[PDB]
Amino acid sequence: RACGLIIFRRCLIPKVDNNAIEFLLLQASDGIHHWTPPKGHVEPGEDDLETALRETQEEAGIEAGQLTIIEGFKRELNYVARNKPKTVIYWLAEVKDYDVEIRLSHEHQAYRWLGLEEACQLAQFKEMKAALQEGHQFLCSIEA
């Protein structure tokens, strides 16, 4: 059982920015092929949202002060990785600063900020794509 945050940022501009919302994906170092938002495993004590935040600071270097959780959205992904069964829960979180410092751990070798389409294209796996898409869709509704 793992929890994480679909991190996104807002790009606010007069046609300069192709998109108003960009997602953070992190590249796995081991395997060299996996792109996900920050996530990780639940500790014995831990609340699920507690993991998502903690794991976001560990994986991406983003502290809670640099983050705001969008209430009302959550997505449980159920799938199969490395011949093993996986459960990941994600919430949507927004970064306060466009230029927030991303600090990777050994687990990841690069990050990218992406518009919804390219993000889905990079994530590749259907459940992750589905989740980012519904994440975005959620965000558009709240806006209106």
Curated annotation (Swiss-Prot):
Record's cofactor remark: Divalent metal ions.
The keyword Hydrolase belongs to this UniProt entry's keyword annotation: yes
Keyword set includes Glycosyltransferase: no
MF (Gene Ontology): bis(5'-nucleosyl)-tetraphosphatase (asymmetrical) activity; bis(5'-nucleosyl)-tetraphosphatase (symmetrical) activity; GTP binding
Motif Nudix box positions after renumbering to this chain: 40-61
Cofactors named for this entry: a divalent metal cation
Enzyme nomenclature, EC number: 3.6.1.17
GO biological process: AMP biosynthetic process; apoptotic process; ATP biosynthetic process; cellular response to oxidative stress; nucleobase-containing compound metabolic process
Alphabetical list of SUPFAM superfamilies matching this protein: Nudix
Gene Ontology cellular component list: mitochondrial matrix
Keywords annotated in UniProt: Acetylation, Disease variant, GTP-binding, Hydrolase, Intellectual disability, Neuropathy, Nucleotide-binding
Xref: PROSITE patterns: NUDIX, NUDIX_BOX
Signal peptide: none
Entry-linked InterPro entries: NUDIX_hydrolase-like_dom_sf, NUDIX_hydrolase_CS, NUDIX_hydrolase_dom, Nudix_hydrolase_domain, Tetra_PHTase
Enzyme class label: hydrolase
Gene3D superfamilies with a match to the protein in the record: Nucleoside Triphosphate Pyrophosphohydrolase
Reaction it catalyzes: P(1),P(4)-bis(5'-guanosyl) tetraphosphate + H2O = GMP + GTP + 2 H(+); a 5'-end CoA-ribonucleoside in mRNA + H2O = a 5'-end phospho-adenosine-phospho-ribonucleoside in mRNA + (R)-4'-phosphopantetheine + 2 H(+); a 5'-end FAD-phospho-ribonucleoside in mRNA + H2O = a 5'-end phospho-adenosine-phospho-ribonucleoside in mRNA + FMN + 2 H(+)
Superkingdom per UniProt: Eukaryota
Domain Nudix hydrolase: 1-136
Family: Belongs to the Nudix hydrolase family.
Described function: Catalyzes the asymmetric hydrolysis of diadenosine 5',5'''-P1,P4-tetraphosphate (Ap4A) to yield AMP and ATP. Exhibits decapping activity towards FAD-capped RNAs and dpCoA-capped RNAs in vitro.
PANTHER family membership: BIS(5'-NUCLEOSYL)-TETRAPHOSPHATASE [ASYMMETRICAL], DIADENOSINE 5,5-P1,P4-TETRAPHOSPHATE PYROPHOSPHOHYDROLASE MUTT
Clinical disorder: Intellectual developmental disorder with or without peripheral neuropathy: An autosomal recessive disorder characterized by global developmental delay appearing in infancy or early childhood, intellectual disability, and progressive sensorimotor neuropathy with associated distal weakness. Affected individuals have hypotonia and delayed walking with an unsteady gait and frequent falls. Additional features may include dysarthria and subtle facial dysmorpism.
Name listed for the protein in its UniProt record: Bis(5'-nucleosyl)-tetraphosphatase [asymmetrical]
Phylogenetic placement of the source organism: Eukaryota, Metazoa, Chordata, Craniata, Vertebrata
